[PDB]
């Protein structure tokens, strides 16, 4: 019953050329995301923003992991060192480095992403799955 130390609250696909916000509420029904997808125009630059809270004590070596799949096969594993933070009221926002969506007919279509937010103790702070669809246009 003790309040949880880490609460992961949001994922945002940050892309200033997108026509509207691309956001997941990670305190909600995570299974529903598997039936949804964000559309990104091919070749565009974007970042991922993970929003989280630390409530009671220092967290060491937070890490964000994304495994990307296409048609059921894992095509990439990337880890990000999110860092170490004390408790505070205000949200923390971590951003991945800018990347470019792939482009071309071969690369277009849907991708599924398995995300995990962890730390030096390998605690599963939250794991979730979401989808991206790469299209010629928005």
UniProtKB/Swiss-Prot annotation:
GO terms for biological process: negative regulation of apoptotic process; regulation of protein localization; regulation of Rho protein signal transduction; regulation of synaptic vesicle cycle; Rho protein signal transduction; semaphorin-plexin signaling pathway. Coiled coil: none annotated. There is a cross-link at residues 74, 77 (Glycyl lysine isopeptide (Lys-Gly) (interchain with G-Cter in SUMO1)). It comes from the Eukaryota. Keywords: Acetylation, Cytoplasm, Disease variant, GTPase activation, Isopeptide bond, Phosphoprotein, Ubl conjugation. There is a cross-link at residues 74, 77 (Glycyl lysine isopeptide (Lys-Gly) (interchain with G-Cter in SUMO2)). The modification N6-acetyllysine is found at residues 41, 63, 77, 114. One of its GO terms (cellular component) is cytosol. It is found in: Cytoplasm. The modification N6-succinyllysine is found at residue 77. One of its GO terms (molecular function) is Rho GDP-dissociation inhibitor activity. Signal peptide: none annotated. Belongs to the Rho GDI family. Controls Rho proteins homeostasis. Regulates the GDP/GTP exchange reaction of the Rho proteins by inhibiting the dissociation of GDP from them, and the subsequent binding of GTP to them. Retains Rho proteins such as CDC42, RAC1 and RHOA in an inactive cytosolic pool, regulating their stability and protecting them from degradation. Actively involved in the recycling and distribution of activated Rho GTPases in the cell, mediates extraction from membranes of both inactive and activated molecules due its exceptionally high affinity for prenylated forms. It is linked to Nephrotic syndrome 8: A form of nephrotic syndrome, a renal disease clinically characterized by progressive renal failure, severe proteinuria, hypoalbuminemia, hyperlipidemia and edema. Kidney biopsies show diffuse mesangial sclerosis, with small glomeruli, hypercellularity, increased extracellular matrix, and contracted/collapsed glomerular tufts surrounded by immature or abnormal podocytes. Monomer. Interacts with FER. Interacts with PLXNB3. Forms a heterodimer with RAC1. Interacts with RHOA, the affinity is increased by three orders of magnitude when RHOA is prenylated. Interacts with PSMD10; the interaction increases ARHGDIA association with RHOA, leading to ARHGDIA-mediated inactivation of RHOA and ROCK and prolonged AKT activation. Interacts with KANK2; the interaction is direct and may regulate the interaction of ARHGDIA with RHOA, RAC1 and CDC42. Interacts with RHOC. Interacts with CDC42. Interacts with NGFR (via death domain); NGFR binding decreases the affinity for RHOA. This is Rho GDP-dissociation inhibitor 1. It comes from Homo sapiens (Human). The gene is ARHGDIA. The chain holds residues 65 to 202 of 204 of the full protein.
